[PDB]
Amino acid sequence: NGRDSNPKYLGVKKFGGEVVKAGNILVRQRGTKFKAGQGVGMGRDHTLFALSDGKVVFINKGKGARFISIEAAQ
Amino acid sequence: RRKLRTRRKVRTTTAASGRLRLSVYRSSKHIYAQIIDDSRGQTLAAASSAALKSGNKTDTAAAVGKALAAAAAEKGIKQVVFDRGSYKYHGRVKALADAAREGG
Amino acid sequence: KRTKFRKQFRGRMTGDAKGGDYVAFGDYGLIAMEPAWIKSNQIEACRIVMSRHFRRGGKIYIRIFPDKPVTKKPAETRMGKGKGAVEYWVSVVKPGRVMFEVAGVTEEQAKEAFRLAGHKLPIQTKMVKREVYDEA
Amino acid sequence: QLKTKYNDQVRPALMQQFGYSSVMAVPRIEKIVVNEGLGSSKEDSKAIDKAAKELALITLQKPIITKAKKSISNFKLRQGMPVGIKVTLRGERMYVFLEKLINIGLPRIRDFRGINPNAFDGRGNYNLGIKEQLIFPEITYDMVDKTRGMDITIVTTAKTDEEARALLQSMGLPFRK
Amino acid sequence: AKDGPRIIVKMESSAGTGFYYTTTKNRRNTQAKLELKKYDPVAKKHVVFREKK
RNA sequence: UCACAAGGCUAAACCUUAUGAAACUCCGAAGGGGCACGCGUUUAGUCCGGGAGUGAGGCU
RNA sequence: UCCCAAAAUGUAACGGAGGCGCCCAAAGGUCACCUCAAGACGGUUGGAAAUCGUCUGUAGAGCGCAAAGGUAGAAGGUGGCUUGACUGCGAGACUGACACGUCGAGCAGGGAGGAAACUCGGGCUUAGUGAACCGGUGGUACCGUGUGGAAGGGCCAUCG
RNA sequence: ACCCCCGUGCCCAUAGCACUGUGGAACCACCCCACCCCAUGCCGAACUGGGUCGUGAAACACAGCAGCGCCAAUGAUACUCGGACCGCAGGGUCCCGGAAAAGUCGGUCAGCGCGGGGGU
Ligand SMILES: [Mg+2]
Ligand SMILES: [Mg+2]
Ligand SMILES: [Mg+2]
Ligand SMILES: [Mg+2]
Ligand SMILES: [Mg+2]
């Protein structure tokens, strides 16, 4: 009644076809909404983040297994 | 039940390792022990006991490891890692290990 | 008429009919020409009327069920909360929605029972026969 | 421990009349399962050792205690606490206990015209209604505590109950007559 | 964080020749006798800490 | 998942037929957001530092 | 924590519902293995539910708690060893007016489990909390009013 | 080169299940025995260890098969960005693009690699 006014935040912090950097956060999530690909590490709270620097692109597989990955730039 | 293989396989990191995947198939007294790359659908070396180890049965373990090790160094290898299926450790598969590892 | 289990509250909103045929379950139906709420009564009213027309009818089919808890100002003001858990339960109707349908009775019996059912309704209505079969 | 009458006679029995595909097609015995009903209404943490004693003495094999299913229904129940005992019998030991019963414990029983012939496991397995624990050669009232009873399930590879009955019968299973 | 009449406790640490605190939530409830673990002081580490105060 | 209309079946279940949903979702737009490019016309932007006011809004 | 929240984020109400002020020396680390709820046939204490067996069985179960997400290749269910519920650090980011808050590769000292690649700076995550001040205690040896000490203070823990 | 088998990937249901016909000494599987390595909170069922005969039964492999799943058009619609209006209100229409869900027409019982073993 109503007694939670805090937003957390979530969403997706770095989208697809986006230049990223190493240590950036590509996503904030509750469970694993999508899992990590190559280039990607994952913290305690899930939260896919970047190992390397590059172009972050998305792979959406078969409805409910999804993946964020980092392809090279150079 | 068949999740043992899927577990042990998904455990081993394909890409982020950089290394290579040495499989083993222990089924009949015939075995495989083929060594696969991670990424490219291809396979690097792959020795086997598949034909004529000449009376050796599970003792051929060392041999089929030994062979592979040699056959490995041919293309060259940097510390490939061990992908088994269900089959865990000790006598049978540990000999293929102690052979192909330390034999190169 | 009344629901036995729920979440207990609601909003409100409207758009064109979805969940009713032109016809099913009998020969002649009754269709709403206007969007509105129908109370637990007005059906009870219409059920008891159509029934009080032909006894051993025997087909009275009410395809509308109210589950819409609505509330009311108990006595007064705004200092307080949302209120009135049990005031009345409506259903929501919208044109093309077929509220009632009957059969086993005459053509004229349907005409007149639907006419008596017409009043006691917050909405305009009308009656038809069957062209259409979508699924069965 | 037989296995000779197991092979031969049981197999061609159905091969010489209605025919059959192969020697491996013919039904075989997978395991014998002994489940000791305990706990709930009758539960003793002291008599656990009793039932385990008898059980371990009869089958030449150590018994294993079950648990609760993580349920509380109405009456006595909880997440876990021993509700009963289990012993699985396979191979030589299965046949030990089996000949033990059939050759001795089966004929010796109260008012015994047989055990129920009707379909037990539609898929071709078999169950038993064993009541008294004292009807065995391996358990008598010479040395005892109280009176209880055990349950036994027979698993076979039989495809139907018709292939069950005739199978288990030649092994010395009598039927209600 | 907060404290009062209650069970458990927070003790911290102490040990041979190192002088140091791990500062760890313990408990007196289910199992408490030794609060004992292995930890790293100003030494090479490699040393056992007895967390009973 | 909760609600629910008729019939069958021997009251859950189960099938035929038929619906409701802010806290249901097998599905799912129009639109919205981020990035890049300008492939196109435009003009504002950011940073440092001085001075503010404002922190009662109103209607459609 | 859901809904309201108009498919980014955010968003009010004396709006609609429900939790928290903990717990776990193992519910942590790692390694190794295990797979659920339910239904139908048959069984001794049973005869709605126990326990056993056969059969079906992407979850209809479980996850210490509220709920949402997430989970079956486990995050679930057992054991082996254990104490990374570490010390000195923090590339780079999410988030916030600030103050806080969160995620974190990689580096060293040193350990843990594994044969191994490796994982480990508490717990599937998201609540279990409280700036500053003034004090309690253990370490340190920086200041110390002429000087050498000591009192008092500082700095690292840390308790109220 | 072609048949086929064992391992292993990409694809992760238009590749899944059911019904099922073929396959046995090449490969696979049961079955085989196990004091001992190793293990079973009880049983070598599972791990695991020693090897054939035996059958291809069961499992796995291949093939027929579209009863079930799964994918699924065109047309038309629901809704809607923008533009312009009606009705006191609930609510509604017109122009203009975008445009589903479901259902029907259908579509399938996969496809693309790598290494090795054994046939013609
Ligand atoms: Mg305002
Ligand atoms: Mg939002
Ligand atoms: Mg929005
Ligand atoms: Mg003050
Ligand atoms: Mg408009």
Swiss-Prot record, chain A:
GO terms for molecular function: rRNA binding; structural constituent of ribosome; tRNA binding. The keyword Coiled coil does not apply. Part of the 50S ribosomal subunit. Contacts protein L18. GO terms for cellular component: cytosolic large ribosomal subunit. The chain holds residues 12 to 85 of 91 of the full protein. The keyword Iron does not apply. Binds the 5S and 23S rRNAs and also the tRNA in the P site. This is Large ribosomal subunit protein bL27. It comes from the Bacteria. Keywords: Ribonucleoprotein, Ribosomal protein, RNA-binding, rRNA-binding, tRNA-binding. Belongs to the bacterial ribosomal protein bL27 family. The gene is rpmA. One of its GO terms (biological process) is translation.
Swiss-Prot record, chain B:
The gene is rplR. InterPro entries: Ribosomal_uL18_bac-type, Ribosomal_uL18_bac/euk. This is Large ribosomal subunit protein uL18. Part of the 50S ribosomal subunit; part of the 5S rRNA/L5/L18/L25 subcomplex. Contacts the 23S rRNA. Contacts protein L27 and the 5S rRNA. NCBIfam families: L18_bact. One of its GO terms (molecular function) is 5S rRNA binding. Belongs to the universal ribosomal protein uL18 family. PANTHER family: 39S RIBOSOMAL PROTEIN L18, MITOCHONDRIAL, LARGE RIBOSOMAL SUBUNIT PROTEIN UL18M. One of its GO terms (biological process) is translation. Keywords: Ribonucleoprotein, Ribosomal protein, RNA-binding, rRNA-binding. This is one of the proteins that bind and probably mediate the attachment of the 5S RNA into the large ribosomal subunit, where it forms part of the central protuberance. One of its GO terms (cellular component) is cytosolic large ribosomal subunit. Pfam families: Ribosomal_L18p (PF00861).
Curated annotation (Swiss-Prot), chain C:
The keyword ATP-binding does not apply. It holds the Pfam family Ribosomal_L16. CDD domains: Ribosomal_L16_L10e. InterPro entries: Ribosomal_uL16 (IPR047873), Ribosomal_uL16_bact-type (IPR000114), Ribosomal_uL16_CS (IPR020798), Ribosomal_uL16_dom (IPR016180), Ribosomal_uL16_sf (IPR036920). GO terms for biological process: translation. GO terms for molecular function: rRNA binding; structural constituent of ribosome; tRNA binding. Keywords: Ribonucleoprotein, Ribosomal protein, RNA-binding, rRNA-binding, tRNA-binding. It comes from the Bacteria. GO terms for cellular component: cytosolic large ribosomal subunit. The keyword Metal-binding does not apply. Binds the 5S and 23S rRNAs and is also seen to make contacts with the A and P site tRNAs. Interacts with A site tRNA mimics, and is probably one of the key factors, along with a helix of the 23S rRNA, in positioning tRNA stems in the peptidyl-transferase center. Belongs to the universal ribosomal protein uL16 family. Part of the 50S ribosomal subunit. Contacts the CTC protein (RL25). This is Large ribosomal subunit protein uL16. It comes from Deinococcus radiodurans (strain ATCC 13939 / DSM 20539 / JCM 16871 / CCUG 27074 / LMG 4051 / NBRC 15346 / NCIMB 9279 / VKM B-1422 / R1). The gene is rplP.
UniProtKB/Swiss-Prot annotation, chain E:
PROSITE patterns: RIBOSOMAL_L33. Part of the 50S ribosomal subunit. Contacts protein L35. One of its GO terms (biological process) is translation. One of its GO terms (cellular component) is cytosolic large ribosomal subunit. The lineage of its organism: Bacteria, Thermotogati, Deinococcota, Deinococci, Deinococcales. It holds the Pfam family Ribosomal_L33. GO terms for molecular function: rRNA binding; structural constituent of ribosome; tRNA binding. Keywords: Ribonucleoprotein, Ribosomal protein, RNA-binding, rRNA-binding, tRNA-binding. Belongs to the bacterial ribosomal protein bL33 family. InterPro entries: Ribosomal_bL33, Ribosomal_bL33_CS, Ribosomal_bL33_sf, Ribosomal_zn-bd. This is Large ribosomal subunit protein bL33. Binds the 23S rRNA and the E site tRNA. Coiled coil: none annotated.
